[PDB]
PDB file of C-alpha atoms in Angstrom:
ATOM      1  CA  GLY A   1      -3.404 -19.697  -3.649  1.00 31.79           C
ATOM      2  CA  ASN A   2      -2.818 -15.936  -3.583  1.00 33.01           C
ATOM      3  CA  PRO A   3      -0.741 -14.617  -0.653  1.00 34.74           C
ATOM      4  CA  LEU A   4      -2.445 -13.104   2.368  1.00 34.09           C
ATOM      5  CA  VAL A   5      -0.311 -10.483   4.099  1.00 34.27           C
ATOM      6  CA  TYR A   6      -0.814  -8.195   7.130  1.00 35.80           C
ATOM      7  CA  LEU A   7       0.024  -4.711   8.358  1.00 33.27           C
ATOM      8  CA  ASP A   8      -0.300  -3.874  12.056  1.00 33.67           C
ATOM      9  CA  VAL A   9      -0.744  -0.122  12.428  1.00 32.86           C
ATOM     10  CA  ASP A  10      -0.206   2.323  15.316  1.00 34.92           C
ATOM     11  CA  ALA A  11      -1.434   5.901  15.512  1.00 33.51           C
ATOM     12  CA  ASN A  12       0.596   8.045  17.936  1.00 34.11           C
ATOM     13  CA  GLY A  13       2.130   4.873  19.376  1.00 31.68           C
ATOM     14  CA  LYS A  14      -1.100   3.010  20.163  1.00 37.84           C
ATOM     15  CA  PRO A  15      -2.415   0.094  18.063  1.00 36.78           C
ATOM     16  CA  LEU A  16      -5.323   0.558  15.676  1.00 36.35           C
ATOM     17  CA  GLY A  17      -5.319  -3.106  14.690  1.00 34.28           C
ATOM     18  CA  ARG A  18      -4.527  -5.167  11.616  1.00 30.65           C
ATOM     19  CA  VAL A  19      -5.107  -4.711   7.888  1.00 30.03           C
ATOM     20  CA  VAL A  20      -5.142  -8.023   5.992  1.00 29.61           C
ATOM     21  CA  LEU A  21      -4.524  -7.880   2.235  1.00 32.14           C
ATOM     22  CA  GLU A  22      -4.975 -10.458  -0.536  1.00 34.42           C
ATOM     23  CA  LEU A  23      -2.306 -10.066  -3.208  1.00 32.87           C
ATOM     24  CA  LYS A  24      -3.517 -10.945  -6.680  1.00 33.61           C
ATOM     25  CA  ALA A  25      -0.439 -12.955  -7.705  1.00 29.62           C
ATOM     26  CA  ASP A  26      -2.538 -14.746 -10.307  1.00 29.20           C
ATOM     27  CA  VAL A  27      -3.037 -11.454 -12.193  1.00 31.27           C
ATOM     28  CA  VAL A  28       0.121  -9.528 -11.266  1.00 29.72           C
ATOM     29  CA  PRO A  29       2.725 -12.013  -9.949  1.00 26.94           C
ATOM     30  CA  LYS A  30       5.714  -9.631 -10.072  1.00 27.37           C
ATOM     31  CA  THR A  31       3.873  -6.828  -8.287  1.00 25.06           C
ATOM     32  CA  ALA A  32       2.373  -9.212  -5.725  1.00 25.52           C
ATOM     33  CA  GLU A  33       5.771 -10.839  -5.074  1.00 26.88           C
ATOM     34  CA  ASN A  34       7.399  -7.466  -4.412  1.00 24.09           C
ATOM     35  CA  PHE A  35       4.776  -6.464  -1.830  1.00 28.40           C
ATOM     36  CA  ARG A  36       4.832  -9.922  -0.187  1.00 30.93           C
ATOM     37  CA  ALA A  37       8.619  -9.890   0.311  1.00 30.17           C
ATOM     38  CA  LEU A  38       8.534  -6.296   1.566  1.00 30.74           C
ATOM     39  CA  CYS A  39       6.001  -7.398   4.206  1.00 30.57           C
ATOM     40  CA  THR A  40       8.125 -10.338   5.439  1.00 30.69           C
ATOM     41  CA  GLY A  41      11.311  -8.281   5.179  1.00 32.00           C
ATOM     42  CA  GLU A  42      13.087 -11.400   3.864  1.00 30.89           C
ATOM     43  CA  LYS A  43      15.407  -9.410   1.542  1.00 34.43           C
ATOM     44  CA  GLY A  44      16.801  -7.423   4.481  1.00 29.91           C
ATOM     45  CA  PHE A  45      14.468  -4.435   4.076  1.00 30.39           C
ATOM     46  CA  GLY A  46      10.767  -3.616   3.838  1.00 30.15           C
ATOM     47  CA  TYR A  47       7.752  -2.019   5.438  1.00 30.42           C
ATOM     48  CA  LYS A  48       8.318  -2.793   9.123  1.00 31.33           C
ATOM     49  CA  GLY A  49       8.743   0.475  11.026  1.00 31.71           C
ATOM     50  CA  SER A  50       7.658   2.692   8.100  1.00 31.30           C
ATOM     51  CA  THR A  51       4.692   5.111   7.909  1.00 25.19           C
ATOM     52  CA  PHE A  52       1.520   6.176   6.154  1.00 25.13           C
ATOM     53  CA  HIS A  53       2.949   9.555   5.109  1.00 24.09           C
ATOM     54  CA  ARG A  54       0.182  10.782   2.789  1.00 23.28           C
ATOM     55  CA  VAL A  55      -3.483  10.303   3.678  1.00 22.40           C
ATOM     56  CA  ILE A  56      -6.378  12.152   2.029  1.00 23.07           C
ATOM     57  CA  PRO A  57      -9.937  11.681   3.384  1.00 26.83           C
ATOM     58  CA  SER A  58     -12.447  10.402   0.794  1.00 29.26           C
ATOM     59  CA  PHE A  59      -9.552   9.336  -1.437  1.00 27.19           C
ATOM     60  CA  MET A  60      -6.796   7.018  -0.157  1.00 26.35           C
ATOM     61  CA  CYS A  61      -4.117   6.183   2.419  1.00 26.39           C
ATOM     62  CA  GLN A  62      -0.545   6.024   1.086  1.00 29.64           C
ATOM     63  CA  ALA A  63       2.479   4.273   2.599  1.00 27.39           C
ATOM     64  CA  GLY A  64       5.592   2.297   1.695  1.00 23.03           C
ATOM     65  CA  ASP A  65       8.368   4.884   1.583  1.00 23.30           C
ATOM     66  CA  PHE A  66      10.669   2.990   3.961  1.00 24.42           C
ATOM     67  CA  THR A  67      13.834   4.843   2.844  1.00 22.05           C
ATOM     68  CA  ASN A  68      12.804   8.528   2.922  1.00 24.47           C
ATOM     69  CA  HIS A  69       9.448   8.382   4.770  1.00 21.36           C
ATOM     70  CA  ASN A  70       8.070  11.279   2.693  1.00 21.94           C
ATOM     71  CA  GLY A  71       6.974  10.030  -0.737  1.00 19.77           C
ATOM     72  CA  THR A  72      10.261  10.479  -2.582  1.00 18.85           C
ATOM     73  CA  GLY A  73      11.813   7.129  -1.716  1.00 18.18           C
ATOM     74  CA  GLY A  74      11.281   3.398  -1.466  1.00 16.09           C
ATOM     75  CA  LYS A  75      12.728   0.543  -3.497  1.00 15.48           C
ATOM     76  CA  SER A  76      11.530  -2.796  -4.861  1.00 16.41           C
ATOM     77  CA  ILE A  77      13.046  -6.239  -4.360  1.00 15.12           C
ATOM     78  CA  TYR A  78      14.173  -6.096  -8.018  1.00 16.42           C
ATOM     79  CA  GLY A  79      15.968  -2.753  -7.970  1.00 16.91           C
ATOM     80  CA  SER A  80      14.968   0.865  -7.377  1.00 19.09           C
ATOM     81  CA  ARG A  81      12.011   0.817  -9.805  1.00 19.46           C
ATOM     82  CA  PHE A  82      10.119  -1.750 -11.907  1.00 17.02           C
ATOM     83  CA  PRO A  83       7.657  -1.656 -14.859  1.00 20.54           C
ATOM     84  CA  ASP A  84       3.858  -1.497 -14.805  1.00 18.60           C
ATOM     85  CA  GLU A  85       3.007  -5.189 -14.991  1.00 21.15           C
ATOM     86  CA  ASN A  86      -0.515  -4.637 -16.361  1.00 21.17           C
ATOM     87  CA  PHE A  87      -3.657  -2.584 -15.699  1.00 23.22           C
ATOM     88  CA  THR A  88      -6.074  -5.526 -15.651  1.00 22.89           C
ATOM     89  CA  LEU A  89      -7.505  -4.991 -12.153  1.00 21.52           C
ATOM     90  CA  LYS A  90      -9.446  -1.732 -11.718  1.00 21.36           C
ATOM     91  CA  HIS A  91      -9.876   0.813  -8.918  1.00 24.25           C
ATOM     92  CA  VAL A  92     -13.409  -0.422  -8.269  1.00 26.32           C
ATOM     93  CA  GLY A  93     -14.051   0.992  -4.774  1.00 24.54           C
ATOM     94  CA  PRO A  94     -12.910   1.136  -1.138  1.00 24.43           C
ATOM     95  CA  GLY A  95     -10.331  -1.475  -0.132  1.00 23.67           C
ATOM     96  CA  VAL A  96      -8.429  -1.509  -3.431  1.00 23.33           C
ATOM     97  CA  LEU A  97      -4.662  -1.919  -3.011  1.00 20.84           C
ATOM     98  CA  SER A  98      -2.656  -0.234  -5.772  1.00 19.53           C
ATOM     99  CA  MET A  99       0.908   0.919  -6.517  1.00 18.51           C
ATOM    100  CA  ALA A 100       1.826   4.571  -6.128  1.00 17.23           C
ATOM    101  CA  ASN A 101       4.143   5.895  -8.820  1.00 15.02           C
ATOM    102  CA  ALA A 102       5.765   8.942 -10.415  1.00 13.83           C
ATOM    103  CA  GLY A 103       4.602   8.187 -13.951  1.00 12.50           C
ATOM    104  CA  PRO A 104       4.766   5.122 -16.213  1.00 12.43           C
ATOM    105  CA  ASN A 105       7.031   2.285 -15.034  1.00  9.52           C
ATOM    106  CA  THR A 106       8.148   3.827 -11.724  1.00  7.49           C
ATOM    107  CA  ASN A 107       6.829   1.273  -9.233  1.00  7.02           C
ATOM    108  CA  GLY A 108       9.042   0.919  -6.169  1.00  6.13           C
ATOM    109  CA  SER A 109       7.539   0.127  -2.785  1.00  5.37           C
ATOM    110  CA  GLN A 110       4.950   2.867  -2.275  1.00  3.23           C
ATOM    111  CA  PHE A 111       1.327   1.777  -2.287  1.00  5.07           C
ATOM    112  CA  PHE A 112      -2.115   3.071  -1.429  1.00  2.00           C
ATOM    113  CA  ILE A 113      -5.367   1.699  -0.094  1.00  2.00           C
ATOM    114  CA  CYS A 114      -8.421   3.387  -1.615  1.00  2.00           C
ATOM    115  CA  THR A 115     -11.327   4.582   0.523  1.00  2.00           C
ATOM    116  CA  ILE A 116     -13.514   5.321  -2.541  1.00  2.00           C
ATOM    117  CA  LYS A 117     -13.781   4.226  -6.170  1.00  4.12           C
ATOM    118  CA  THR A 118     -10.875   5.981  -7.929  1.00  4.82           C
ATOM    119  CA  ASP A 119     -11.674   5.234 -11.547  1.00  2.75           C
ATOM    120  CA  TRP A 120      -9.394   7.967 -12.992  1.00  2.00           C
ATOM    121  CA  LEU A 121      -6.402   5.900 -11.815  1.00  2.00           C
ATOM    122  CA  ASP A 122      -7.321   2.934 -14.053  1.00  2.00           C
ATOM    123  CA  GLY A 123      -4.594   2.416 -16.637  1.00  2.72           C
ATOM    124  CA  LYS A 124      -2.162   4.596 -14.647  1.00  2.00           C
ATOM    125  CA  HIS A 125      -1.652   2.684 -11.379  1.00  2.00           C
ATOM    126  CA  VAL A 126      -1.204  -1.086 -11.072  1.00  2.00           C
ATOM    127  CA  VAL A 127      -3.892  -2.577  -8.840  1.00  2.00           C
ATOM    128  CA  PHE A 128      -2.592  -5.701  -7.130  1.00  2.00           C
ATOM    129  CA  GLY A 129      -4.881  -6.624  -4.264  1.00  3.62           C
ATOM    130  CA  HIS A 130      -7.544  -5.619  -1.786  1.00  4.27           C
ATOM    131  CA  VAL A 131      -8.458  -5.461   1.899  1.00  6.34           C
ATOM    132  CA  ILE A 132      -9.699  -8.822   3.239  1.00  8.73           C
ATOM    133  CA  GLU A 133     -10.106  -7.576   6.810  1.00  7.18           C
ATOM    134  CA  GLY A 134      -9.468  -4.353   8.717  1.00  9.20           C
ATOM    135  CA  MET A 135     -11.333  -1.724   6.707  1.00  7.72           C
ATOM    136  CA  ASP A 136     -12.144  -0.231  10.158  1.00  8.82           C
ATOM    137  CA  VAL A 137      -8.404   0.299  10.642  1.00  6.58           C
ATOM    138  CA  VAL A 138      -8.194   1.868   7.161  1.00  7.62           C
ATOM    139  CA  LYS A 139     -11.048   4.262   8.093  1.00  8.23           C
ATOM    140  CA  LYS A 140      -9.183   5.229  11.271  1.00  8.41           C
ATOM    141  CA  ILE A 141      -6.050   5.989   9.223  1.00  6.12           C
ATOM    142  CA  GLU A 142      -8.177   7.943   6.715  1.00  8.89           C
ATOM    143  CA  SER A 143      -9.643  10.038   9.551  1.00  6.87           C
ATOM    144  CA  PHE A 144      -6.135  11.255  10.453  1.00  4.69           C
ATOM    145  CA  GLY A 145      -5.502  12.593   6.948  1.00  5.45           C
ATOM    146  CA  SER A 146      -6.060  16.020   5.407  1.00  7.35           C
ATOM    147  CA  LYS A 147      -6.672  17.785   2.096  1.00  9.02           C
ATOM    148  CA  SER A 148      -2.897  18.229   1.642  1.00  7.79           C
ATOM    149  CA  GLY A 149      -2.179  14.595   2.546  1.00  7.44           C
ATOM    150  CA  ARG A 150      -0.442  15.659   5.759  1.00  6.66           C
ATOM    151  CA  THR A 151      -1.314  13.368   8.688  1.00  8.22           C
ATOM    152  CA  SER A 152      -2.479  14.686  12.069  1.00  6.93           C
ATOM    153  CA  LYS A 153      -1.235  11.572  13.883  1.00  8.20           C
ATOM    154  CA  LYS A 154       1.946   9.558  13.334  1.00  5.51           C
ATOM    155  CA  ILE A 155       0.788   6.402  11.520  1.00  6.21           C
ATOM    156  CA  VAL A 156       3.339   3.586  11.741  1.00  7.99           C
ATOM    157  CA  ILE A 157       3.357   0.018  10.418  1.00  7.55           C
ATOM    158  CA  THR A 158       4.831  -1.570  13.555  1.00  7.75           C
ATOM    159  CA  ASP A 159       4.712  -5.129  12.236  1.00  6.22           C
ATOM    160  CA  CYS A 160       3.963  -6.824   8.933  1.00  4.97           C
ATOM    161  CA  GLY A 161       4.314 -10.180   7.253  1.00  3.50           C
ATOM    162  CA  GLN A 162       2.708 -13.109   5.497  1.00  4.94           C
ATOM    163  CA  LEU A 163      -0.226 -15.187   6.777  1.00  7.14           C
ATOM    164  CA  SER A 164      -0.428 -17.693   3.901  1.00 10.21           C
TER     165      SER A 164
END
């Protein structure tokens, strides 16, 4: 079946707990595969040690820039950027996992977890999974965001990987 992956998250160096994500490889295999491998780190790079650098309450929590840690960087397992696979899955509500981008066909490694329905992102961002467990952790992360996206605590993915 679809991969289950995890992110263990600290805030200011103390654990918040674990976010478990189902990756919809059946709908978006290339996008799911990229995220999966970045969680295990099997290509020699990935999310371990990186941050949630942009968090906006009542919107989303963004992470995945493991090269620049500021929203400008990241890379995929395929190369620096890869195409929008499809827009089949929609931003239906809290828990949606979707690719951040800088316009059409600029997926790299940055991703966001929604804390609300973000319907205006349908057809613009590739949705590729959702939160199975740990929405409480996501709400904690969300609570350390701001209007500008600037975080008030240092939010770090200390560990990540694949469960199944």
